[model samples]
Target: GSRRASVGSVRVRALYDYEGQEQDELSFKAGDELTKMENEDEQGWCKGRLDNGQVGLYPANYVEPIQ
Candidate 1:
């Protein structure tokens, strides 16, 4: 999945490491599995959760949608 498509609770894989600048966001490494909580916003950001149940936002481009 090269396309940027996600629904609430959709699964995706991180394509690049993202060091979230905001405290409400999440820092993830490439290849990390994430559960995209929603679709992208105006700023190209998406909310998601990690395996540890940490919910936060990340760059939409940093992730790859999975089936």
Candidate 2:
């Protein structure tokens, strides 16, 4: 079943490092806006899951909301 909902929007900065650590040190200011999912753990870090199903953790602070 396809999920239908608004996950809100955010500017993805740096992606997760090779060690699986969220690398806030280096990031792309021009990030992709992701759709928030209901199953997403908002309390924890938000990960960017692509259409191919590739997932990576991103620092919440690094991401800025679209004003």
Candidate 3:
């Protein structure tokens, strides 16, 4: 499913590099809004999506809630 379809209404920006080990892992530069799953962020990982329509888990701490 598109992260824009299953994720939260809240958006956030990355503060650091998010590491991943698979092609499905969503990666992005700082200052980009990653769509977070509705309160689904685990200990340090949360689901997010890119504007290109890719979705994956990333470091929750790496992002900050945006307005």
The residue-by-residue lDDT of candidate 3 on 1-67, one tens digit each, is 6655543466788898765678867888777667775454548777767756788777777888775
Candidate 1 has an lDDT of: 0.84
Candidate 2 per-residue lDDT, tens place, 1-67, comes to 3322334433333333222344422223335443322233666555554333445654554444444
CA shift at 54, candidate 1, in angstroms? 0.7
Q: Any runs in candidate 3 off by more than 4 Å, and if so which?
A: 1-7, 38-42
The global C-alpha lDDT for each of the candidates, from Candidate 1 onward, is: 0.84, 0.41, 0.72
lDDT of 1 by residue, 1-67 (tens): 6334433468899999888687788887989898988879999999889867888888999989777
Question: Candidate 2, after superposition: displacement of residue 24 in Å?
Answer: 14
* TM-score of model 1 vs. true structure: 0.80
Number of colliding residue pairs in each model: 0, 1, 0
Flag the better candidate by lDDT, 1 or 2.
1
TM-scores of the candidates in the order shown: 0.80, 0.33, 0.70
Q: What lDDT would candidate 3 get against the real structure?
A: 0.72
